[PDB]
Amino acid sequence: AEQGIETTELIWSLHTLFGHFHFCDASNGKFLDLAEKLLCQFINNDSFLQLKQILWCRYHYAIASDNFSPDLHDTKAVEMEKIHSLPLGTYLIKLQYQNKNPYLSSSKTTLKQIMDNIIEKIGDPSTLDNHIISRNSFLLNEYLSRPITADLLKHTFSGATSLYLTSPNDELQQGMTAGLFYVSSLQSLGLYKMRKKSMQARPSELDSIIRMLKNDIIYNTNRFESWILLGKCYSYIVEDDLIWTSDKITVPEKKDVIALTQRKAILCYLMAISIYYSKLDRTIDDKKIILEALDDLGSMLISGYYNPMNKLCFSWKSSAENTMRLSETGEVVMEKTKKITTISDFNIEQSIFLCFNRACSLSGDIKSQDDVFVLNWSSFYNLAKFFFKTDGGNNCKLVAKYITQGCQIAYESSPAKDPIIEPHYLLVNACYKWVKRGVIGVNEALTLLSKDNQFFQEQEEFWVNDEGLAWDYQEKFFFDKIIRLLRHLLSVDKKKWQHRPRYRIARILFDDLGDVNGALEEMDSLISAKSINKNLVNIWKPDFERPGKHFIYTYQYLVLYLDLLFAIKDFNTTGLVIKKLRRFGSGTVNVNELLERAINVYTQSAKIKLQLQDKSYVEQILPTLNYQEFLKISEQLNQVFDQGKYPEEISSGLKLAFQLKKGHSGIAFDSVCLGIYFEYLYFPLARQDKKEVFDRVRLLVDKIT
């Protein structure tokens, strides 16, 4: 004790003396070597401070402490061995965190660079030297390759799920006993999350961290937190693939790898929970971490179970893709393996509810053991996502006092920048759907809005179930109140959630109120067809707004906008939508299919509002026209044609149909353009008296333009 203190003072004095005349580099830095060797055994922060100075003097490892200065005694940089790096990093862990959980500790990036240096000097664990490491990795790959059975979930909840790993008991066993890759992966994930908040994080960065977690796990460290982190890495991968890549969703083959990653994250979480359940003396902090792990696993199960996934992670194919099938003749048939679902869906729903029930139970246990613990709305949000299109609010007395708590936590923990709209948003959506379908008692449903008037800040007459009217009028006034709350949602900062409020505005105004004009006026500010220099859909993306919303949601809004325009049969705005959509390729995915659908709606609106007879212009009129008569009538028409002598709808429809015929593959706009031409320009002049007709149409369009 006193020996280490006196040694620290002596070492500091000598280091100061050497920096005073810049001469520690004599005798090859073996003084620094000896001092490092002795300070490896001295566990105090002053020894740590002198060790920071030693690392900056020797290998030039700059350790950024705010109260620290370089004692430069003119020493050249050396390279540290792995043999020196291991107890040094162990000392760094034990001095940085001591008895505090590094997961719960704030991430100090002071040690982070030197951590990366120690990792680089260590490198990867070399395989092909331990049967234990090879066998444990093989078992790990097997366990990830295992399908999903409900009995496995039962054994996870009872803690009977184990892989029965063996610790390699090597030199680096103590380093993973320190959880070196765990701390390094924790730093990597914290910096990854910070880059994800700045949206500069990339999925290729995670593979090294995942491999580090594998290398830590195969040491049989009995650390379920590593499983939690590996499942979290797979979870963040799955989040990136599902949100930022719709093409992986549409392609079933990439969806297979997505389901594989879902299965891997689920297996990591189940192993983590069963390892925790295998622990006997489980402390409170273990409950705190495993509660979060329960939340992650329940969220992953919600993600994997529902649309657009729909239980693909529970459908299993064998690794041997071809089945040697015995025929009844005694001959062998190679047969392709099919995906077989390995668990019934009711068991999956049970597992989800059991995870959330045990999460609520452990939340009550922790709040009994730590009453300053702050609860989460996410349990009620996930139960509402269970209630999404499944229950219909049959348990209305139990619908109350869980959405109540969800909205209460959402508003009471609402920050000043942007409140937690989503429980109240989903409450509004569920109230709309179940009032419209009549599945609920409206009285307590509107009475809970008096509680949620904390978030609403409107009058109590809005939440009084005033049933002294016709039910449609009560619903419409409820829609007025929802529109008022939507204006309240426009009033907030709305970092990325303007568009779905406008969608709900359109859903109120069209589906329910019948005011197609008001919905069109609302969506014309969102979709500017009649402009020229703007885009098609104005979701405020000049050069700044991130993708992800306008990939699919803008397509869906344009689908509903096509429905709105087809309700009133306006073709001019539809053609302007198509013209803006030709330059809006980067604003959405599947521009070709949306362009085809917009062409379909434009042609249907033009045929319905103006009227046509298509099967006549091509097969019947064109073979029966004399060539000289057609030339004479078309030339007299081209000499005769004035835009003031025809309606602007007819001439603009002809111009738009010919322009879209020049833009697209001909056939889709032969019918409309030939119909407009032969019905309004050719035959009325003929009664008074394809390439050729479309050239005359081109001449008349050049007369229009």
Binding site: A150, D151, M324, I340
Partner: protein
Amino acid sequence: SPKRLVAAPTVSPPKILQTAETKAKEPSILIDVPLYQADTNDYLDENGQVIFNLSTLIKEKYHPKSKELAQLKDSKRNLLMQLSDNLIGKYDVEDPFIDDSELLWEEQRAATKDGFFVYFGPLIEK
């Protein structure tokens, strides 16, 4: 001509004889599995095989009283919701999961005779 696939003779089913509760959670189980022709008590011909599963026979020997599947699903999930507000050999009501649909799936997959046989010679596909 190659010798045809004669049908498997009707072997009498294996029956659980004695189950004694050990100090472990899994009791010791004695089962007689007949491996002969049940009609002649001869050695089986070349085309006989006995195929069976353990835990399916466990649930069948101990719990023949399987109720309606949808009713049992609703009862178990409502039991879980009411609880919100290993018995090896006995049927664990505290276990929420029902395996019988998946047991049927496994029975169908094992009911395939495809990949389980003996081929004399190299595996050359026709």
